[PDB]
Each structure stands twice: as C-alpha cells, then as structure tokens.
Coordinates of C-alpha atoms in Angstrom, one line a residue:
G1 CA 122.5 92.2 93.3
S2 CA 123.3 92.1 89.6
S3 CA 121.0 94.8 88.0
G4 CA 121.7 97.4 85.4
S5 CA 119.9 100.7 85.9
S6 CA 122.3 103.5 84.9
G7 CA 119.7 106.0 86.1
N8 CA 119.5 106.3 89.9
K9 CA 116.3 108.4 89.5
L10 CA 114.2 108.9 92.5
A11 CA 110.5 109.8 92.0
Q12 CA 107.0 109.3 93.4
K13 CA 105.3 108.2 90.2
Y14 CA 104.6 104.5 89.6
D15 CA 107.9 102.6 89.7
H16 CA 108.1 99.7 87.4
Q17 CA 111.0 98.4 89.4
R18 CA 109.1 97.9 92.7
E19 CA 106.0 96.7 90.7
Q20 CA 108.0 93.5 90.0
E21 CA 109.3 93.3 93.6
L22 CA 105.7 93.5 95.0
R23 CA 103.9 91.0 92.7
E24 CA 106.8 88.6 93.3
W25 CA 106.3 89.0 97.1
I26 CA 102.5 88.7 97.1
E27 CA 102.0 86.1 94.4
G28 CA 104.3 84.0 96.7
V29 CA 103.0 84.7 100.2
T30 CA 99.3 84.3 99.4
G31 CA 99.7 82.0 96.4
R32 CA 97.5 83.7 93.9
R33 CA 98.5 84.5 90.3
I34 CA 98.0 88.2 90.2
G35 CA 98.7 88.0 86.5
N36 CA 100.0 90.7 84.2
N37 CA 97.4 93.3 85.2
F38 CA 98.9 94.2 88.6
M39 CA 95.8 96.3 89.3
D40 CA 92.9 94.3 87.8
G41 CA 94.4 91.2 89.4
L42 CA 94.4 93.0 92.8
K43 CA 91.1 94.7 92.2
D44 CA 89.2 91.6 93.3
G45 CA 90.3 92.7 96.8
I46 CA 90.7 89.0 97.8
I47 CA 94.5 88.7 97.4
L48 CA 94.6 91.8 99.6
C49 CA 92.6 90.4 102.5
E50 CA 94.7 87.2 102.4
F51 CA 97.9 89.2 102.1
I52 CA 97.6 90.9 105.5
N53 CA 96.1 87.7 106.8
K54 CA 99.2 85.7 106.0
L55 CA 101.3 88.2 108.0
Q56 CA 98.8 88.5 110.9
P57 CA 96.7 85.6 112.1
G58 CA 93.3 87.2 112.3
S59 CA 93.7 90.2 110.0
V60 CA 90.5 89.5 107.9
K61 CA 87.9 87.5 109.7
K62 CA 86.2 86.1 106.6
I63 CA 86.7 86.8 102.9
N64 CA 84.1 86.7 100.0
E65 CA 84.9 84.6 97.0
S66 CA 82.6 85.3 94.0
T67 CA 82.6 86.7 90.5
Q68 CA 80.6 89.7 91.5
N69 CA 81.8 93.2 92.3
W70 CA 79.7 94.3 95.3
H71 CA 81.5 91.6 97.3
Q72 CA 84.9 92.6 96.0
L73 CA 84.4 96.0 97.5
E74 CA 83.6 94.7 101.0
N75 CA 86.8 92.7 100.9
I76 CA 89.1 95.6 100.2
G77 CA 87.4 97.3 103.0
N78 CA 88.5 94.7 105.6
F79 CA 92.0 94.6 104.2
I80 CA 92.7 98.4 104.2
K81 CA 91.5 98.4 107.8
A82 CA 93.4 95.2 108.7
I83 CA 96.7 96.7 107.5
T84 CA 96.0 99.7 109.6
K85 CA 96.3 97.8 112.8
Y86 CA 99.2 95.6 111.7
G87 CA 101.6 98.5 111.3
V88 CA 100.6 100.8 108.5
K89 CA 99.7 104.4 109.0
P90 CA 96.4 105.6 107.5
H91 CA 98.3 108.4 105.8
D92 CA 100.1 105.8 103.6
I93 CA 97.1 103.6 102.9
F94 CA 95.0 103.5 99.7
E95 CA 91.3 103.9 99.4
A96 CA 88.7 101.2 98.4
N97 CA 88.1 103.3 95.2
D98 CA 91.8 103.6 94.5
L99 CA 92.0 99.9 93.9
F100 CA 88.4 99.2 93.0
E101 CA 87.9 102.1 90.7
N102 CA 91.6 101.9 89.8
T103 CA 91.4 105.7 90.1
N104 CA 94.9 105.6 91.6
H105 CA 97.7 103.0 91.1
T106 CA 100.6 104.7 92.8
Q107 CA 98.5 105.3 95.9
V108 CA 98.1 101.5 96.2
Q109 CA 101.8 100.8 95.5
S110 CA 103.1 103.2 98.1
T111 CA 100.9 101.4 100.6
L112 CA 102.6 98.1 100.0
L113 CA 106.1 99.6 99.9
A114 CA 105.6 100.2 103.6
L115 CA 103.9 96.9 104.4
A116 CA 106.9 95.0 103.3
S117 CA 108.9 96.9 105.9
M118 CA 106.3 96.0 108.5
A119 CA 106.7 92.3 107.8
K120 CA 110.5 92.5 107.6
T121 CA 111.1 93.6 111.2
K122 CA 108.7 90.9 112.4
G123 CA 110.7 88.2 110.7
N124 CA 109.1 87.5 107.3
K125 CA 110.6 86.7 103.9
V126 CA 110.1 89.9 101.8
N127 CA 111.8 90.4 98.4
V128 CA 111.1 94.1 98.2
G129 CA 113.8 96.7 97.9
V130 CA 112.6 98.8 100.9
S131 CA 114.9 99.9 103.6
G132 CA 113.7 102.0 106.6
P133 CA 111.1 104.7 106.3
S134 CA 111.8 105.9 102.7
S135 CA 109.7 109.0 102.2
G136 CA 110.6 111.1 99.1

C-alpha cells in the first residue's frame, strides 16, 4: 500500500513501523486505548491478558482490574503463558519484567510480531505487516 520509506533497512532494534501496526491491531481487537506510551499503556498487563483472550476463548481465566502494581504483575503472568499454548514459542516470548520493568521493549514487540501470524492462519483480522516466520 501507499507508503514512502526509501530505506528498506532490516534490523532487530525497535521498529517504529511495526509499533504503529501493533497498537492499531490491539487497540482494536481488545478495545483499550493503549495511548501514546506503547509500553506504559501495555504495562498494566490487562490489555495483554484480554488480547490473547480475544483470539482464544479461555486464554486467561480471570483478569485483575485495579490501580495497583502487584496485581498488574500477576496478569502479565497469565498472558505470557496463555500465548505460549495458543501458538507462540517460549523463545520468542517476553518476560514479566520485560514489560513490567520495561527493561526491554524490543523483546515484547518481537513477541507480538509472531502472535499476529498465529491469528492470521486461524482466520482473524490482523493489520500487521508480518508474513511467514520472519527471523532476521
């Protein structure tokens, strides 16, 4: 589709291109306003639990909704594990601290990049530029 890049640069670092393709997919499926801060907004861990839930009926049994942190952690824990069964290898999944302690952003992004492909085959509406197992 119409899109000027004039770069065609392939890297592993945080891609600002996909960042817009992910938030646009999640913010839609689930229905939560991730907001500017792609991380902080996803830190809560809620949007995550619901994300894998919308794709698989039963992913996350129950989710905690509060303004605390301790609870936010537990949530992310259920998701990361939920996405593991759906169709996401543990070698491409982020850690609870990666999203919680925002110690790693790319690690979390890469995880989603794959998820999108897991929902595509099934028959979902994904707006992420991810074709086949792109590793590199």
